[PDB]
Subunit: 62 residues, 2 copies
């Protein structure tokens, strides 16, 4: 699986996930800097208030 | 949890999920009409080839 791992609006970059991993995630929250977006492989746990989405296809997490 | 449950580009509608449900899903595939998007509560299992994304916040699956 290949997932985007770039932050917010920075240039698209990807991460080749570990074998067996089928998900990508997109984590979003807002603070003084505005809306922050973190992307990567897997589907991690997050604090309440953080918007998490996980998807199961190639580079599905932009 | 409240999730969108409208199809493709129809007007947005929502569904109040069952008490224990915390996920919303966005499922996409292609047919003669073009790209089709199904939305609802939960995080269903999909056949290979079908693009699936599940998220855990209010109306997160547009």
């Amino acid at each position: 699986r290949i997932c985007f791992n770039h932050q917010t609006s920075q240039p698209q970059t990807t991460k080749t996930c570990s074998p067996g991993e089928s998900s990508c995630y997109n984590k979003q929250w807002s603070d003084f800097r505005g809306t922050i977006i973190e992307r990567g492989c897997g589907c991690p746990t997050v604090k309440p208030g953080i918007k998490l989405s996980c998807c199961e296809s190639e580079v599905c997490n932009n």
